[PDB]
Ligand SMILES: CC(C)(COP(=O)(O)OP(=O)(O)OC[C@H]1O[C@@H](n2cnc3c(N)ncnc32)[C@H](O)[C@@H]1OP(=O)(O)O)[C@@H](O)C(=O)NCCC(=O)NCCS
């Protein structure tokens with residue numbers, strides 16, 4: 094079953110099937126003309142001359158786009174929209190409590206970004222300084238990210254659900270000079286500590302770089318205050334001049350770092366530059382969502398994740414959209430919350446995640462009860478695979494069978510959408526990301542690196558660069574080259590597996606490395622094992638993912654205690670809380686399986702394939718039998 098392109102979409106679409114085909118072929122055959130022309134979606138301070146300048150050569154990866162052009166992201170997201178659209182809403186903010194919302198016009202946002210840019214400059218922040226942002230889903234998170242970009246500071250946004258230890262690791266690695274936070278965030282009626290977590294983070298004796306903490310009063314909770322270091326947001330911004338002249342950034346000036354979990358090691362800072370990234374986010378946002386002036390757009394992703402960077406803030410604002418920032422969760426106070434927000438603000442484009450869809454579907458019709466949903470023209474899904482059944486529930490209940498669903502496959506490392514439908518150009522298959530975006534050349538290779546032709550499956554690689562590609566890993570270009578460009582030479586390895594069907598549509602099966610997907614959150618099995626083994630009573634651990642109906646994968650941890658320690662309710666609780674402390678609640682094992690029987694190769698390497706199979710139900714060979722009975726209990 095292919096879903097046809099509906100007439101209302103065909104009548105209005107920016108790109109039809111023929112235009113998709115033609116532009117696709119040109120992006121591939123002639124990237125310099127294609128991306129040379131498409132780069133004009135942005136305003137450049139000085140024009141680029143060179144367009145594509147890239148190599149995936151082994152141990153010698155170099156990615157540059159538009160390299161001689163200069164520009165300012167904040168000017169593209171704000172300034173250039175003032176003359177025509179200064180009165181238009183830039184951001185609709187919907188509170189965790191429905192009595193709370195705000196409309197923030199382009200003019201108002203610009204003025205606050207200008208005030209906050211001066212605040213930053215007056216505080217001593219300079220172009221290239223890294224600024225850590227640990228904020229909830231409030232408009233001020235946006236102001237802080239845009240102010241940083243405006244001055245050429247390099248923001249590093251840390252998701253609010255990270256623990257103080259996780260916050261400190263990111264601060265240490267990036268040498269962040271400043272932390273921007275709130276006293277607390279508000280989520281599903283609960284107040285979540287943020288500033289306290291920062292206080293704990295800065296007590297780590299390896300944190301040396303942070304000179305100030307800017308705190309937004311979001312809840313007025315009693316916090317500890319260090320005079321001098323700590324500064325209230327309101328105090329600072331109100332003293333700052335609202336006049337700020339944006340300076341030109343080179344196309345290859347660093348824009349942001351985003352810590353991202355890998356197959357091995359601890360999270361690394363995926364680094365995006367300015368020009369290609371922003372051309373790519375604005376271009377993909379515009380065509381995949383079929384954005385028309387006046388469309389109300391809603392991405393539900395947190396600002397702490399890449400989806401929140403590219404498609405909550407940067408892509409939409411570049412295009413002059415009204416973008417909605419929701420503080421809470423789609424099913425609080427009730428499962429109908431998400432659709433209530435859609436009606437309240439007349440959302441035309443809704444972009445969400447399969448975990449949220451599956452949580453709402455588990456509530457059947459309570460998800461749509463009392464709601465109208467008519468304003469909706471376009472639906473999106475990203476972050477994890479969506480089965481045909483969930484896709485169909487989404488298409489029917491939320492979109493009322495009237496809205497194309499754009500299932501967008503991509504990654505932190507890709508900056509923007511990679512394999513995705515375009516709503517007026519491509520016919521949909523439930524559960525398929527479908528076809529590559531402009532400038533994207535995917536392939537499927539076997540474990541030896543041989544391309545597989547026709548209907549097939551294999552390792553999903555991208556065989557050439559695209560403007561939005563991550564340029565490096567902060568402080569570690571060698572690890573960037575190793576992780577992504579060493580498995581299959583001269584190719585970008587995504588670490589995902591995929592099938593290609595008889596039509597040439599891609600079906601992403603999931604990570605083939607040791608990376609988990611837990612409620613749409615990318616986590617490394619290695620880092621969770623490191624966190625566990627750091628516990629004074631734990632000798633060894635092996636972490637796998639198991640299928641879970643809502644979350645996609647749940648975390649299953651095999652744990653070996655040091656001699657002289659026993660399993661108890663207490664130790665169970667302590668070990669789970671230890672992971673919460675090391676990483677955050679998102680990384681907490683759902684199951685602890687206590688064992689002295691980790692399977693290992695003769696060289697001592699833990700073999701996870703079998704652990705994966707046992708946990709799901711599907712040197713010393715005796716360990717498998719012990720493991721089987723332990724699992725059954
Ligand atoms: C958002 C949604 C997609 C799934 O939620 P989720 O991302 O998996 O996270 P949850 O809401 O379950 O919370 C898990 C933990 O992470 C924390 N967390 C999640 N987001 C956070 C954030 N933005 N900032 C700080 N902490 C956060 C929660 O507080 C909770 O921690 P705790 O139990 O130790 O106090 C959607 O299904 C939803 O609204 N969840 C309902 C709550 C729930 O029970 N979810 C589990 C599946 S039903």
Ligand SMILES: CCCOP(=O)(O)OC[C@H]1O[C@@H](n2cnc3c(N)ncnc32)[C@H](O)[C@@H]1O
Nearest residue numbers: 475476477478501502503504505601604615
């Ligand atoms: C939304 C982008 C999130 O970026 P992150 O870097 O956090 O996660 C990237 C990984 O999410 C999965 N993934 C993402 N989108 C899809 C998708 N649409 N279908 C299947 N899997 C997906 C793929 O496994 C991918 O390697």
